[PDB]
């Protein structure tokens with residue numbers, strides 16, 4: 001099945017890149033809640049975090 | 055000497071704060087692990103330099 | 106050369122891409138060094154470790170909330186530091202601070218073993234014209250399922266609301282099953298598929314929460330196409346009769362009317378229903394405008410079955426011996442699942458030989474096995 005069989009292996013070898021790429025893309029990934037205006041909320045909510053009312 | 059300084063050093067080693075068994079539910083890529091403690095609930099908690 | 110041409114471009118590009126991203130991991134952090142680098146330090150100290158999972162019952166608009174933790178104790182926490190209150194709202198799983206509990210952010214969300222049955226992990230490898238023939242009762246399923254996603258333009262000219270829903274009905278084996286999975290390959294939008302045998306449960310109250318869910322997820326991740334495969338299964342399947350029965354069937358039906366439609370104003374949830382017990386449904390289900398164009402399928406005619414049988418014999422080894430047209434002669438207003446089982450059974454004759462060839466003899470023999478099935482749960486012989 002020579003003409004087809006060669007491509008079939010080469011497809012498997014290709015797949016091995018797709019897994020590796022998912023792991024490198026996820027190695028350096030960041031995540032947020034609420035971004036830029038709640039950087040400001042850190043200044044304020046850190047003074048109020050020291051107290052007890054929670 | 056190997057003997058007596060094995061006893062004296064095991065008295066230190068036996069003293070713990072409690073060291074648990076957890077299971078990993080899933081990872082998060084902020085470099086933290088969501089671990090469900092087997093009796094207790096879930097806590098996202100940082101990892102050591104060996105893992 | 107015809108496979109290779111495809112491969113040569115596409116592989117080399119996936120190899121480069123991969124390599125690119127390795128050198129690049131480091132490079133992400135380089136345009137900053139105090140512009141964002143510093144910001145990251147500030148957020149972290151606030152967070153500390155462990156971040157304790159809670160469940161947010163409700164918010165109060167004074168920068169606080171009441172959490173109930175799965176560890177028992179409720180806490181009157183404060184929504185402070187690195188959090189929007191627009192990413193808060195009932196059902197959230199939250200990160201609490203391990204001294205005084207403040208909500209530092211929401212990152213955690215947890216999938217159900219029922220949204221796992223609903224949500225699919227595939228994109229269908231088969232596409233359209235794998236049961237093809239009856240290919241004019243298929244533009245009632247691609248002018249009202251495929252097309253208002255693909256073009257808004259056409260239905261803007263005429264104005265008004267664009268299509269909504271289809272009920273597929275007909276004989277069994279006449280392609281209904283494959284129709285639904287063949288439009289989901291073409292559109293490429295969230296394909297939910299739920300069996301109706303799972304909508305019937307042996308426990309009450311959970312029945313309605315399941316049916317109420319399918320369209321709520323559906324509207325959330327819109328566009329969505331929800332295949333309800335088999336809604337003929339709601340009156341024929343039922344376990345016990347004391348947590349089954351009438352009551353459980355009536356309630357799931359009632360629920361399903363609010364979802365479609367109803368008052369919800371949920372997302373796009375085109376609906377595809379397969380059935381053949383269409384009169385075990387409500388008049389507010391087979392109501393127009395939750396069904397728009399409805400599609401009837403009957404058994405193919407003689408010249409249609411020639412379209413069907415040439416799709417199926419392309420995948421098989423052939424000879425000059427094979428003759429399609431006399432296989433057509435024998436069958437008379439039978440399903441294309443019958444015709445699909447003769448070709449599947451013909452390679453069963455090849456397998457049985459251990460010969461790699463398929464001949465006219467292999468197709469005629471399995472035609473006799475296919476006709477044995479039909480007339481031998483019969484025992485009248487000639488119509489008494």
Ligand SMILES: Nc1ncnc2c1ncn2[C@@H]1O[C@H](COP(=O)(O)OP(=O)(O)OP(=O)(O)O)[C@@H](O)[C@H]1O
Nearest residue numbers: 235236237238277278279280281282283441442445
């Ligand atoms: N026109 C056709 N061309 C190719 N395959 C066909 C055709 N009609 C039906 N089939 C095949 O027959 C099998 C069963 O059909 P499918 O599930 O698509 O439909 P259906 O009418 O709901 O029948 P059932 O629900 O009893 O299987 C599938 O493998 C399908 O692809």
